[PDB]
Amino acid sequence: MKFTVEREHLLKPLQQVSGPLGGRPTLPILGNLLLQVADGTLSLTGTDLEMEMVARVALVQPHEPGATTVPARKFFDICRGLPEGAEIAVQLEGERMLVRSGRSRFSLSTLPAADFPNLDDWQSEVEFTLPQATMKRLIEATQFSMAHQDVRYYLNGMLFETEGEELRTVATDGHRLAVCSMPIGQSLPSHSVIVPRKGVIELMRMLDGGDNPLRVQIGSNNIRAHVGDFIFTSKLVDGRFPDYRRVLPKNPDKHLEAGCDLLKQAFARAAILSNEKFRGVRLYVSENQLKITANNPEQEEAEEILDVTYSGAEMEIGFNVSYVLDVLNALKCENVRMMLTDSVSSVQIEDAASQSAAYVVMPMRL
Amino acid sequence: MKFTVEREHLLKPLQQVSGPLGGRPTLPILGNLLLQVADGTLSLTGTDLEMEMVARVALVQPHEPGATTVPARKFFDICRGLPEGAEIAVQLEGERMLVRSGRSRFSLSTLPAADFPNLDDWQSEVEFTLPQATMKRLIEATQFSMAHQDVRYYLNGMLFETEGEELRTVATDGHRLAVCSMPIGQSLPSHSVIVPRKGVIELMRMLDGGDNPLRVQIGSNNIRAHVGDFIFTSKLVDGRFPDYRRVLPKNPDKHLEAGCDLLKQAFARAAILSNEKFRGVRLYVSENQLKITANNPEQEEAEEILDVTYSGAEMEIGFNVSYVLDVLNALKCENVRMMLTDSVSSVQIEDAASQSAAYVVMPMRL
Amino acid sequence: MIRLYPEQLRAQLNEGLRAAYLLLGNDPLLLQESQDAVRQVAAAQGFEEHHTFSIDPNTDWNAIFSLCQAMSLFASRQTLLLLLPENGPNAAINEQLLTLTGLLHDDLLLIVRGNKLSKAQENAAWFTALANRSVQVTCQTPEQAQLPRWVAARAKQLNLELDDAANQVLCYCYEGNLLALAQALERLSLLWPDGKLTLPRVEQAVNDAAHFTPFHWVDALLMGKSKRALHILQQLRLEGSEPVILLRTLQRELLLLVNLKRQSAHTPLRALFDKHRVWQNRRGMMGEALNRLSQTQLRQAVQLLTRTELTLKQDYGQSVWAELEGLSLLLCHKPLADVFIDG
Amino acid sequence: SYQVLARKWRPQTFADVVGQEHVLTALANGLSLGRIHHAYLFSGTRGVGKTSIARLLAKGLNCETGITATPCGVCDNCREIEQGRFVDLIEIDAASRTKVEDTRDLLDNVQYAPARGRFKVYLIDEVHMLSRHSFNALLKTLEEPPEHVKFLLATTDPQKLPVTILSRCLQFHLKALDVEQIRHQLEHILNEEHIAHEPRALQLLARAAEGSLRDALSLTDQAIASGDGQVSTQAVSAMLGTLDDDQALSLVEAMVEANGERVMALINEAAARGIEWEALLVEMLGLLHRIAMVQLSPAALGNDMAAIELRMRELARTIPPTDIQLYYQTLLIGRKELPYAPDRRMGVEMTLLRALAFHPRMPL
Amino acid sequence: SYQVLARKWRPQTFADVVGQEHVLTALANGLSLGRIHHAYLFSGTRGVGKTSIARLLAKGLNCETGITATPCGVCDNCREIEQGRFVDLIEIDAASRTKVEDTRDLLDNVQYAPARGRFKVYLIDEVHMLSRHSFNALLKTLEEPPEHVKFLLATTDPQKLPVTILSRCLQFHLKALDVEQIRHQLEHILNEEHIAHEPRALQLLARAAEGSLRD
Ligand SMILES: Nc1ncnc2c1ncn2[C@@H]1O[C@H](COP(=O)(O)OP(=O)(O)OP(O)(O)=S)[C@@H](O)[C@H]1O
């Protein structure tokens, strides 16, 4: 196997392929990238027995077909350390790979390519192309609500649902829920799948904001994503995701509208002195008035008051400041609408002018 | 105690005072900084029984004399969290402190000011003033060579030697040495002192590139630095430091002038595949050429060929790649004159353009 | 605070479900059965969420407090389980438990497992706070006198027939180990679908006789069965049973025998057994020794036991098996030279 | 090559299993009646077949024909399980993987349904080496196990496991393989291996096995290697003699008959190899004590000393008790005086001489 | 500030020591003939000058004038070693550095050449407190030390050390000082200090010394 390439054309695809790899792999082979030269094409593959990433590069110079496996981090460092605009020539000699760049020579150990695991082929069920912007919006909206480590595994992922001409992303962890939906302009059959945390992370990373459309294929238990010359394949978690519709309040009688920035600043100031162990705050809502209070076992109390658009009866309700701050950070809008019924019922948070994204927060016992 | 102060005028002094304070003071009083309002000034002091930092802020609003101790972290966070342009009014009531400003109120706990430790007075043997830039360059030329946690206590600090019309900074760890010299424009008696690494770091953070000269005073076992409204006091290790002249090779014959930029790039490329345990690499200094070969336990060859200005007989020498890379990074020059006497002897790495700075690197028997 | 036994726990749960349940004792089998029954009843009532934590100095009470305070969108009716330290709660644990009891909700079902609490442990603020709304089930291993009743009940509830000889054999082979006895009963039921467990069947099952029963060797010594005692000692040596355990058991029995022998010169043996609360099944074999070994014996035996115990405490020698065999023959009617007793 | 007997003769069927009837019959009845429990544990001495029986049970559980006590051995599932490539059978070495992080990833796989089997079987070996956090995670998993998973455990130190773990699983204890069964198994193995053998060699190997089949197979392999591809009585006898080194018993016998030359020769032979003189004295004292106990009652001698049973019985029957007592006391005095002797060898020689020809004078 | 007689009167020359004539003669002969070993071990009771002899040997080896059995005592190296601040003389307290990691770190730096002196001397004290792993790690390098390093070992319980370490070094055993020698040394010290004394007091002190001059 012999080929020659440019540093610029190889720096980015190599970084994308080697990004997922890290730590100590289950097997040494999983810690290496598979390089294949064939029909004037260089294919870089990286997998960890749960997901696969494939990148392709065009060759316009003499080359020899072949296949090998090489270390990821060391090869990436060697490629990055060379001067900009240099030419990298890769050759295979015995059980070694020789990399040449001007007067710089490197010899790297290799392993047989036959030992590299390969995922079995599968047939897709629903195929659809959408702009990267919509996927980025959905991910940034619904990522923060996923659970970190729970016995219920299906809550650790994100629920992607195709309904009519709409795509919806839902996340929850048993205490808070985030839902978003966007149109796609094409009719697709009703379907629902669960994506794991690592898959969502990789899908978010691979997006670059470019004009290249993202093509998504969903099958029985696998999902494939095409973006330019990058292909990402992942598996689907098995389970029954809870229905989000029942979570939403049926009839929230009391409504409130508040400035996002001022409310967020007030919440942060209240949380500065709030109990670190609990991070709990107490809200007193009255006619055109919202008061936030916090306290700690050291008898230090923090109080703040602000003016809002409210017309209901006075109420007292406890909350966890972390969830509210996360929701406010997610919603980047001038005004935020909060709908609630009582102190022991879930509160719904939405944008004043946009209803695409909604959040549900369960109040804390206080 | 009662005083109103502008937030902007109080931001930087608070950060400077909180800098030296550590995360774990092990004493409640240590974690709290001393605030004293007197006449028309406010003094903020922070000490950790080894170093002291004092800052002064002018007061224009009416106030009363007083002294107290307040937590550094909470007070700094409260001051920084307030909106820009706000005026902070601080008052003392009983054991509590009111930090009312605008619509926000806080109640910070306070401790007696008498319990705050103080440092005994001392006599200044030497006094001088130098520009901030010269001190910054001197410290940067030799900071990296200071030992981190060597058993020798005296090797954990930097040696400052005022001699004739110049000031010299020396650092070492038993394997590598760094020396820098700069004129001061004023004759001072010969004197040598040792400063701990923490003091050097604090002095570096103190400098900001301002035009105000830095005034340095040195006593029997103490050092004081004054700049603007900031004063810093530190103790001395009070030990012996090996003489640099003896460590410096005597009349080396080889004077290899290498291409600092490409030299360090090749060194890093070799270090990529170098022995991780020892970080050692073989430098084959050939006629107007250098071959940096790195070999790791994986036996991955990292022979890099570069063009240098060597003119003597070819020589192989083993060097720790990390030390060489650090020296090259510190040099920040165009050509590096490695003056070599023999393979087993140390190499004097100097800046070819500037002979004021120098380093000594010991080889290894690979 | 209600107090019950494992048998009445099912009836209490059928009557109703209380806010808190305490499981204190030293019998893992009964505690596990009670926990399983309580969890099954709670799941029937609609408790599909369960949480368990271990109490120790390095405990994250913040997570427990957050779970208690935090609500659930759909998975309500939480269940929490705590495992107390073997030593028992301390002042820090006492105040932590008091705080946890302060933060209690109707949807949270609390279960606690640990050893029996002493008077000082019982007299705690958290313990008194739950007095009006708690039921404690005592779960401890029954003594040998009450063992056959439990064995018969367990066999009956499994739809099995046990003979008196089979019951006695099972009690003798698995005294103090109810888990092993239950496993043996299950294996016997598997072996024989008809469910008829005659004495030969269990005797064949007893052929295993794995280990951990030096009391069998001590009883053989007490009965004067030199052959049986020697055989059991050989089997224990093959099994690698801790010689220190054998030494301690024989030490307890020999001290009791020495006291009885010395104080029986003016009192009947049966009266002394009644005074010491000895078990009639033991009283027999003990009496045989007390009617088989003179005062000269049980003194040379005491000397040998003391020397061996000192040697194992200071030298930890592995030749203790030979000394145990010598002491075994000494405990029998064998004269012995008295030189092997280092006398 | 010829492979290893132990490796090539892993029991592939319940019939091939030697002994352990009380476990095999119970497992077969449970499989036939469908009474299958969530957690199974196996305990016993080394080389008793715990792992083999666990593998056989796993093969039977996930056979294509059905849940039967007699696996077909021809379907794809049986072949994969025998080769160890079965996807739904997860074998874990707890000794190698003890940290909680390693065990958590393996335990998290229970969420996925079986791919090509009725049940997802986990076979954990050396489970007694798991950490406290690993035990806690295992208990959490076993509290509410999925209906479609089974756990099999094998260890030699069940006491190390927490009582909570033990209480939630059914435990089977394996016994020894006796002697006749081991001899029959070795005879069958050698007949199938086309390796010449003799009955006496097989009997000696079975006697040296001491209830362990793995030890018996190792000794058979040693005999084959030393016998140059053939098993013979002379080869096995020489192999055992290389592991006997019965200088202590020979010294005792020579001393009892008052043969100084034999005693000196045996002392020189013992000194040829590295031996501890105090250990030799302790062994002689133990042998004398055992002889005295046997004289007191014939039942003192057990199966642990079956190798030298005849010699011990002859010594007990022949020597009067008084001579044994005198020799034991002399050896006790010698052991007491050994530390301050000029040399350990000199002390042992002096004590043996005193026992041979001298009699102490007791007070009064 | 004030220093006790034991610290003040530490010998600084081979002629200032008491007894141990055989050890001094052997060391002098070895230095004169040029036959210098790479591993020296000193054994004996307490307070017999093992550390003092090791320090004297270290001074002699690294003296500026040359390898001589009579150090000048005036050059920079001699003064630095006497004052206990010599760079190339590394003193290890095995009683507090028993960790194998410390030994490995020390061995990793042997390849570097000495800074000033012609040899890099390691003086390990109370070596009997080192762990088995430390001894095993030492074994290999002690068998093949570079040409520019030396090892000096001082021990009071040589029995604990393994035979492998013992066979890799030249052993010197120090004889306990006699009562007459202790009395003479005490009399000489008192005469040098100009302190009145009586023969019976010196005899009693020597008898109570029990072979230890430090006592
Ligand atoms: N019951 C048995 N029947 C036939 N061969 C057996 C039996 N037990 C052991 N063997 C032989 O011994 C070998 C090893 O048996 P194992 O099952 O690994 O021993 P073990 O009981 O698992 O010991 P552990 O648990 O690893 S300490 C097998 O490959 C057989 O050759």
Ligand SMILES: Nc1ncnc2c1ncn2[C@@H]1O[C@H](COP(=O)(O)OP(=O)(O)OP(O)(O)=S)[C@@H](O)[C@H]1O
């Ligand atoms: N041979 C000696 N000649 C002269 N003074 C000696 C001698 N031995 C001991 N001393 C005195 O006793 C002090 C202690 O001697 P050391 O050098 O410590 O002997 P030591 O054998 O190293 O003791 P240890 O092993 O460290 S407890 C010295 O400073 C002297 O004052």
Ligand SMILES: [Mg+2]
């Ligand atoms: Mg096994």
Ligand SMILES: [Mg+2]
């Ligand atoms: Mg000493």
Ligand SMILES: [Zn+2]
């Ligand atoms: Zn099958």
Ligand SMILES: [Zn+2]
């Ligand atoms: Zn000198």
